[PDB]
Ligand binder design. Structure first.
Ligand SMILES: COc1ccc2c(O[C@@H]3C[C@H]4C(=O)N[C@]5(C(=O)NS(=O)(=O)C6CC6)C[C@H]5/C=C\CCCCN(C)C(=O)[C@@H]4C3)cc(-c3nc(C(C)C)cs3)nc2c1C
Ligand SMILES: COc1ccc2c(O[C@@H]3C[C@H]4C(=O)N[C@]5(C(=O)NS(=O)(=O)C6CC6)C[C@H]5/C=C\CCCCN(C)C(=O)[C@@H]4C3)cc(-c3nc(C(C)C)cs3)nc2c1C
Ligand SMILES: [Zn+2]
Ligand SMILES: [Zn+2]
Lengths: 178, 12, 178, 12
């Protein structure tokens, strides 16, 4: 597993596209770095669906080629939303090898080892300041085959330091479809 | 009533 | 993989929707069973685009929830057409593992092993009757990780039994997405 | 000039 980020628009561009809801830009890659006027976070494509966290996107539409995309799925119970990924987006396939070696991808395209400890839980192998995971919610947890195990929801801290991560498991993402 | 906006990507 | 088919409209439902261009049925799955007034075949979604054969769909629109969807791409030379995939459409992820174990999915939901022989060719592990592969053009070829390698285009036949398959390779689906 | 119509699906 390896990662690289590319910024595709700036401050003024993002605010505008936010107001019109029409994004003509070429989409690609598996993980979108997304923004509203107030915060920034990630969104991960699994099976045709662009998944991200409700605490980032709230009820919002996604700016797209043909205007705003209305959310297909909104699950406040899971902190989960999804839109139909726009053409170009490269979706991941669900992990089906229940391994416990996972990789979290951050907004800076760090891939960091996290050990799976339960079906929505994993531990980091070295503690991280919170500011280092901040803005990475919605990002992929990955198996060694690069398949999707879930999306990063929250961090678990001892004494203000991150030592574990909580994630919406791919299985619950399948359940919210249908 | 603003939109979420793609401002970059991460390629794997 | 295991695979199963679901019928969702009848003969007349199909002709009518064909005329209106308006389809409100709920769309699930990576592989759609598609029809014009005179023929049936398959479409597969990859990268948020629904793909099929030119000799099947020609230049036709796709019946959809907000009326007729226009084709995003029409590449006659490669027998390739694609529409923006309708909401609910699941996307496969492009294969990147250069594997030679391939599995064709047909309209009957059989998954049959094909041995890769070139960038767009594979031989059937057992030959098949032409009648049994008729109508599965646009179906996917899958690698052992269940990614899309390409879509079924033509069969090579000696006297009525298909011995090998031609398919649109997925690199060329990505190419046509520029 | 008519449309292509989804009349079913293969679930994997
Ligand atoms: C077990 O189930 C759950 C579990 C957690 C939930 C949760 O979590 C809260 C959000 C989460 C967070 O900031 N997540 C991230 C982020 O980096 N976030 S971020 O910076 O990207 C932020 C998007 C902009 C990925 C984390 C990055 C760094 C760690 C920050 C310090 C620890 N901390 C305060 C948290 O982890 C918080 C806890 C929030 C919510 C909801 N919030 C709301 C709204 C209306 C407020 C609706 S539902 N539901 C949850 C559910 C259901
Ligand atoms: C390597 O490159 C290529 C390679 C082949 C191409 C091709 O092939 C032709 C179409 C194809 C076909 O029937 N495909 C399928 C289908 O099952 N088909 S079907 O039944 O689903 C049918 C759609 C409804 C999957 C086959 C099912 C059973 C085998 C039938 C017996 C052998 N046979 C006659 C074929 O394979 C034919 C040959 C046709 C075309 C085109 N034809 C047209 C116009 C002129 C019509 C424009 S482009 N391009 C091609 C290109 C570029
Ligand atoms: Zn896995
Ligand atoms: Zn593969």
């Amino acid at each position: 597993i390896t990662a690289y980020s590319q910024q595709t628009r700036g401050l003024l561009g993002c605010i505008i596209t936010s107001l019109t809801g029409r994004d003509k830009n070429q989409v690609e890659g598996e993980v979108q770095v997304v923004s509203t006027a107030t915060q920034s976070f990630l969104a991960t494509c699994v099976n045709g669906v662009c998944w991200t966290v409700y605490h980032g996107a709230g009820s919002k539409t996604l700016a797209g080629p043909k205007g705003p995309i209305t959310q297909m799925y909104t699950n406040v119970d899971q902190d989960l939303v999804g839109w139909q990924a726009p053409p170009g987006a490269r979706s991941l396939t669900p992990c089906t090898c229940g391994s416990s070696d996972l990789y979290l991808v951050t907004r800076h395209a760090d891939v960091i080892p996290v050990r799976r400890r339960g079906d929505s839980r994993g531990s980091l192998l070295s503690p991280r300041p919170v500011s280092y995971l901040k803005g990475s919610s919605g990002g992929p947890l990955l198996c060694p085959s690069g398949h999707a195990v879930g999306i990063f929801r929250a961090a678990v801290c001892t004494r203000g330091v991150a030592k574990a991560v909580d994630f919406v498991p791919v299985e619950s993402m399948e359940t919210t479809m249908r | 009533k603003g939109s979420v906006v793609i401002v970059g990507r991460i390629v794997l």
